[PDB]
Amino acid sequence: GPVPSRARVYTDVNTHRPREYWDYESHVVEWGNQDDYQLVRKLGRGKYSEVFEAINITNNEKVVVKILKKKKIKREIKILENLRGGPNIITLADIVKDPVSRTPALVFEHVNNTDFKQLYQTLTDYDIRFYMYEILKALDYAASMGIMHRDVKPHNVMIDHEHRKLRLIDWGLAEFYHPGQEYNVRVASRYFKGPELLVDYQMYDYSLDMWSLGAMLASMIFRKEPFFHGHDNYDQLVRIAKVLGTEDLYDYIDKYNIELDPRFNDILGRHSRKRWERFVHSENQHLVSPEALDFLDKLLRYDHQSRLTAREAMEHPYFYTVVK
């Protein structure tokens, strides 16, 4: 069968915790007062919730309310509480019972965000580095706390560009990392799914989030949205192989004794690894540097164990120009 894998960092953090930290099923929710909150505008509806801008009439402060559409409820709540106060982690302000849905409504701090499709059109080289560094602070904090986000994508990064403030949001797919545990591969959005998900390898870890961050970075520095543009989850892997090459894909699956779905026989082909300079052109060149390409190259690796960790990523020369 498949060869097991473990994270190379923060491997055993949950094993040393009291059960209460990670045993979210046993969590007892602490409920606030739903009348403290007035819904103002519906902002969106996702697979699992409706999201509203609201006002906390006790301090007149703007908040965001997510009214949850079974075990995910306490998992998200517990993860949010565990991570609260960490660098660039969205703050859960309250939890109330919505009287109409009769489900939990998570109340979050408000961030004045700018839409990424319009915002990534305007980031300078310096701002890409600056905001990537801020995302890494959140991801390293999460991993150090035994948590993988599993849905890193531009829609889950809220940026107040006026105040140069960033928050990583939507922890509803997040999980606790337990060495040797097999996880659902049906996580993350198509264009951000790591190869481990696409080849059905369940024993993944924090490094999944570093692949997603690399896919985001590639789209930003190359001005290509998305960078790996698959029509479905199978074609998604083929689009990756057309850049990273098939020999390294086979080496990856061979290392973990993984067998590709046989439907790849007729669609995968044989592809050389490309040099990243291939994607550079007159319109994106100002965002590219040798440091950016090297950094990208060390995130976008098939083998999840070989990617930079968030903490190693923060050490990379790409961030030397960023004021700290």
Q: How many β-strand runs? A: 9
Number of helices: 10
Largest sheet, strands/sense/barrel? 5 strands, antiparallel
Class from helix and strand fractions: alpha+beta
Rg value? 20 Å
CATH class of the largest domain: Mainly Alpha
Q: How many structural domains?
A: 2
Q: How big a fraction of the residues is strand? A: 15-25%
CATH superfamily of the largest domain: Transferase(Phosphotransferase) domain 1
**What name is given to the CATH topology of the largest domain?**
Transferase(Phosphotransferase), domain 1
Beginning-to-end CA distance, first to last residue = 46 Å
Summarize the structure.
By secondary structure, the chain is an alpha+beta fold. The chain is built from 10 helices and 9 strands.
Your description of this structure?
With 324 residues, the protein is an alpha+beta fold. The chain folds into 2 domains: 232 residues, Transferase(Phosphotransferase), domain 1 (Orthogonal Bundle), CATH 1.10.510.10; 88 residues, Phosphorylase Kinase, domain 1 (2-Layer Sandwich), CATH 3.30.200. The chain is built from 10 helices and 9 strands. It has a 5-stranded antiparallel sheet, with helices on one face. A hairpin with a 3-residue loop joins strand 1 and strand 2. Helix 4 packs antiparallel against helix 6 and helix 6 packs antiparallel against helix 9. The radius of gyration is 20 Å and the shape is globular. It starts with 18 loop residues before the first helix and ends in a 10-residue tail after the last helix. It is classed as transferase. Keywords: casein, transferase. It forms a monomeric assembly. The entry is titled "X-ray structure of protein kinase ck2 alpha subunit H148A mutant". The protein: Casein kinase II subunit alpha.
